[PDB]
Subunit: 80 residues, 2 copies
């Protein structure tokens, strides 16, 4: 099952909610976690997701990346 | 560089703090992310870490997993810290 289909399933299975995947952004630091922006209800909201889509973790204000630029990336979409 | 060493590096380089790793817990839903509990000074704080230790992401009150048990696992570990 693709990342978007797994990711869609993973959220629905825990929230009963049908989401739209708006924007997927890869992280230069590592391929294990993809920064993704989804539409739930009336808001667009960002999350972190395992590359397989079987885990989502909400964006918090703790985020350190081996590469500096990715911190800009998350900071950009959290302003989005 | 090993997972605990990379994780130590990637945290220190950005908070210039030296931390110990107390507990590492793998998530059954995926191996891509490890739930890890570290010590900053006299605080214990849980975090999520890419399996290679090159991303640390704070535990928030959003976390969804494909396998149900993993939610129990993090929910217990957030209780141990506070």
């Amino acid at each position: 099952a693709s990342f978007e289909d797994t990711l869609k399933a993973t959220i629905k299975s825990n929230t009963k909610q049908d989401i739209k995947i708006l924007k997927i952004q890869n992280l230069q630091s590592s391929p294990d976690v993809k920064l993704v922006l989804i539409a739930v209800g009336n808001m667009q909201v960002p999350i972190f997701a395992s590359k397989d889509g079987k885990l989502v973790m909400g964006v918090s204000n703790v985020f350190f990346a081996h590469k500096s630029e990715d911190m800009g990336a998350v900071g950009s979409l959290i302003k989005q």
